[PDB]
């Protein structure tokens, strides 16, 4: 009964460490007496490996299920394969102009060409997009309201020591997976990679319920969740080392460095499970695992920086627009119509997604097609090529028009969608926009060299009769730069990109563009998109990048103030159960120091509301607190700090040890108490 | 003047953080006034990259110089290349039974064969080994007494916040490098890999002196040293990721995770400098960089565990013998004759090193020859081979005799040498002993399979007419297991091994053997050899693996005790210059709290002996301390803790924040002070 934390609060880690210490002492007491005790102790010890192992296995299985369901469903938007209903379009196309894969215009109208078939397929596409969007939103609203958003803000807040009982419950796993599948099915500008971490996290949570050790102790569950975060990111990107570094960089809040092997094993197990699972015959770990064998030139360095500016500048734009819109939509009438709003957004997407050739295709496949340079058998309009430079046809102008319109779409439509009550991620929109910009700049530079190759800056670099530029690397660097400039990741992103796409020959432009994008972005708000999303949520995140301009002390922050009523404390002997009931009913606080008497106001001990309550009605069902006596249940060694302390040290202590609140006393006379929420309130 | 730390003490990190904050405020006050201050600020910001870059570059250059010099010296121990004096035997032999590479017997006697030449070469080998040993010990004794030991324990203590002014001085770099070269030249059971980190560290230190930001600041220099540790380990082993993972695990004490990129870049820079530098034409990054393309069988798993036991047991044995001997040699007359002791040890080495074929050769080359399996052109006695199993000749028995004698010599002599007043390391002896044991077990299993292949346990796995076992992998796993079992490294060691020896097909047995050896070793002392030396030196290391059995409080450790005189404190108004001077001269303490008056004994402020003294003579050259007045110089916000605090929380705060000492007060009445040394003393 003691030690339970109310939902929507912050954990106190040192008490949890003391609980673990007493549990360890109890285990050691009976450890060596019998072989059965030894077996139990070894099982408890191996539980540390077991939680990570089961979490990784479940994360891999869930990722496989989600991937197969998602690609299957998003394939249904186009047509069906009569011969094999269970397969998708590409399985039937390769399972041998694919007659066995029919569309709906031919299915009903019987015509595969002409305005009529085009209109029929268009109207169907809108209809099916609406159906998936509506059903996903209805399911999430009815069955799980915490599937919203991406899942990085909430997880970051959870690991720091926050509590959200339902955000990782047994129920949210099923609903989250189903609605993520059905949301990525609709083709909305939202991914199934990043948010999958949440799913991974859930695994840990659920399995942590089976072992008592990691359930009662909050810090142990937090460590398991920090491991599951790396496992989930590794599954999402197939970057186990990137996944481990991700938890340290932008997810985990506390790291004793003794669980790094746990995170590494989690990322290995989850990746292994994901790659092993391929029932339909798929070979790639992820849909868009690509490899390169193309070179790049030193003179080619100048344009990345230019692109880097975009990869950064867009960041500043995005984090300045969506955050604004995400605010406005939460205050105007529009926030009271979730289902209708998401229907409208998805309808706008589909209506302005099918006509454009690129957007009609799932965003992962668009990213792939932008990654790969024109293949020997490639004959798409993206490579409208018919002299030192290769000739270009008139169709390149049309391709540029179509692709620039696709960019102008993907940049706008993504801003409005991340604040919807359905699963969504930002990795995919960022990657896609960056890759699109990269391809644009690559084509532009190729044409510019073609027209004016006679200049000295070009004749000595570009070879005659051969390609001089590699737009695939431009797409890669653009994607990485935009992702870095939106979510302000520099090293974890580079590691994940390296693991996703093998080949060390491209690390230099990637690092250059990422650093340039970060530099540009920091000038327009040094907080990542996830940081500012937590800010909008108002969650209690204790930033490790703030600076105190004023040389102020806790004297200005210790509560109460001259304009606030006095704090509530407790006495030992003169006070009985009835007074305790009256005080508890007549006050709405959480923690109470205990003092000898009112006149002295000298700090003696500390206690919390819920222990005091449960204890008093337990005693009533079945008074002096100093040396019936209730001294034992009263904690007597609370952490203190000198009242004249500078605030910076107090903040550092809270961040390092993880104490929800600390007292503040003068000459031994208790004065005030400071909690994380108060520190954040003064942080404004 | 204020803030300087006396040698052989521990740093207080929070005051250093406050100094960093005030410096940051001072720099910010004038950041935007003109472009010149902007340039200065950017230079200060880039200083963080600059220190690591210069440290890595210098470490690489020094490692290259040391490697070439060590090869050249240890090569002259055998003979000389008359045609080209500067070259070594290997280059001269490859520069075309090598007539241009002459030996001593031919040079003087003129005959390359017969007992006479054997005796001449043997005696000259002993003489030259004595010459190198004597010169090395004389140089280290005369010019640098801190080059002793390996250098890992001292570095571990330095990063934690210890101070040793001379252990990294401008002078110790030259002497340390020279004597390490001349010591590895003698061929003693000691390597130039591990200790090179010390050299790397020095670089950092020295170059840190050029930037005021990183010089006056202790914690910043500690971060630079933690980076240089990874850089040095990377240079020694050619494992940049290995070095970065090593710094966190067994070297660094504090890591804010914001310098991990610094350590990673230091490792890359150092590795690049090392590989680039090869003036004599060498291509390998290290002497013994190897690659493998050999398979292994699952049924082959059983003996690794057996070998693991050895790799474990030897660990326990070694850490139980040397630590004992290193104690005895420091308390008996033998400790007053350093030069003669090292002469005796080197003489024993050389005299009992040449007759055995393996020990005659430098230990790195022995490790290489044990790593590589018999090549197609190999015809050495190690491969005495002339039916399902390959026939074995009589020479295998003689090879086994010689190699077991070599193992006995290496296990025996290595114990006595690590406590000598010359540069030495444990990586090389551990690797060599483990590899030797691995090769022994490999040959034994091959012979067993040859003799008793008829059993069902072999016919199902070992093919006819081809080799069934790979002793090279056995040597690799033995080396890794012994190193893990002596130095108690599990993950950093395995990553370093992977980087040193490419190929992921050999991670499973490495992990198995390392884990088994660690399990076996922990049963015989859970402290690594490096930890055991840090203990024996008595340095103030605050272990993060101890457990308090008694439910004791700081009330048990607050000083003074009933049996000790009272603490020295200071008044503010009634005191003057004469009284404070007399009190300072009459006491030998380090910290002094300041109180209103003797009767009250209420904590008010705190100060230090050295700061107080410097302030006193400064004031006298050119009294009230409360609100001439010396209030300002008196610190007024010292960290405190409640007297009834459990000791565990106090230890945790010291380990986390890094405070030398904390006061302890009751009811606001100051009672005592607890410092790291006192906590360690009660840790006994
Ligand atoms: N009017 C007040 N008078 C005295 N103390 C106050 C007053 N208001 C708030 N406090 C102190 O601030 C704390 C509330 O901070 P907060 O973190 O928001 O909630 P909690 O303390 O439940 O975590 C209380 O525990 C209390 O000690
Ligand atoms: N006899 C004593 N009476 C009161 N205090 C003592 C006594 N001996 C030691 N102390 C306390 O212990 C501290 C010495 O601890 P130690 O860490 O070994 O040295 P330092 O304080 O110089 O680091 C002193 O600063 C002092 O406050």
Descriptive overview:
The PDB classes it as membrane protein. The entry lists the keywords membrane protein. It forms a dimeric assembly. Two copies of one chain form a homodimer. Chain A has helices spanning 13-29, 35-76, 89-94, 104-109, 115-143, 152-160, 170-185, 196-208, 212-216, 218-237, 240-251, 260-276, 301-328, 338-351, 357-360, 363-371, 395-417, 427-451, 456-459, 471-487, 492-500, 507-522, 529-537, 577-586, 609-621, 647-657, 676-683, and strands at residues 79-81, 101-103, 591-595, 603-608, 661-666, 669-675. Chain A has 684 residues and is mostly helical. Chain A has a two-stranded antiparallel sheet. In chain A, strands 3-4 form a two-stranded antiparallel ribbon. In chain A, strands 5-6 form a two-stranded antiparallel sheet. In chain A, helix 2 (35-76) crosses helix 12 (260-276), helix 6 packs across helix 23 (529-537) and helix 18 (427-451) crosses helix 20. Chains A and B meet through helix 1 and helix 26 of A and helix 1 and helix 26 of B. Bound molecules: adenosine-5'-diphosphate (2 copies).
